[PDB]
Design a protein around this nucleic acid. Structure first.
Length: 212
RNA sequence: AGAGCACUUUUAUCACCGUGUCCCCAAUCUGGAUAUUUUGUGUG
């Protein structure tokens, strides 16, 4: 129905299972977008549990919505190499096995990278109740978001759309994730996405319906 | 409350040492601002 714009000076979207060296994507993943939308709604996550894993999210009940992503200006990236919180991968021993109070004791720096600027025009098709809840949360009683204001109708920009095995893409993102829980599952099938540069509204294929 | 973003860019250090821009030189040589001009006119 109605959509909104946002911007931020710095951002970072680390792909999962990156390993030692971290990376990022020019466009935030769908799951991160959904998490941001849920956080702004003022509704907490369905899971309240603590342990080895803390993403136990059954899909039994969750508001339905369709999400599109826009991009107005390409952004470069930079890298910083300071420190990282290592997880032991070797038998190791000594001091780590002595104290053992949330130890994470071994430390070794490698790398990581961040973005230079972010400005997106996010598109949402949601029921009226969810939009009203968002309005109440924004107006009522990690350097990721700076400010938000709905300027839907003006300020056109490019969009993204999945591509079928034909022709060739340009300036396309590497990987994208729809739904994921950090345990044994099938992850997501569709990975490749490409942008299209045209002024008017995105096509019907651009909108993607999230299972959650 | 966004695929949970911490635990690290950390601790010391003289670009130092000696070194005359020095030694001679002329702005020199001549030239009539010259030629004429009444402060005149009257008052106890």
């Amino acid at each position: 129905t109605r959509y909104l714009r946002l911007k931020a000076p710095f951002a970072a979207f680390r792909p999962f299972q990156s390993g030692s060296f971290r990376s990022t994507t020019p466009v935030p993943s769908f799951s991160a977008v959904y998490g941001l939308l849920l956080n702004l709604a003022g509704i907490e996550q369905r899971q309240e549990v603590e342990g080895k894993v803390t993403l136990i999210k059954p899909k039994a009940e969750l508001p339905k919505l369709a999400i599109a992503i826009g991009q107005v200006k390409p952004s470069s990236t930079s890298l910083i190499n300071q420190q990282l919180h290592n997880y032991p991968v070797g038998n190791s021993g000594k001091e780590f096995a002595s104290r053992t109070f949330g130890s994470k004791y071994w430390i070794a720096p490698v790398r990581r990278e961040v973005l230079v600027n972010l400005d997106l025009i996010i598109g949402l098709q949601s029921p009226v109740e969810f939009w009203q809840k968002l309005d109440q949360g924004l107006k009522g009683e990690n350097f990721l978001f700076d400010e938000i204001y709905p300027i839907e109708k003006p300020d056109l920009a490019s969009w993204y759309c999945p591509l079928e095995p034909d022709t060739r893409p340009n300036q396309g993102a590497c990987r994208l994730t729809l739904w994921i829980d950090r345990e044994n599952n099938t992850q997501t099938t569709i990975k490749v996405f490409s942008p299209s540069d045209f002024r008017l509204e995105p096509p019907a294929k651009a909108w993607q319906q999230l299972p959650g």
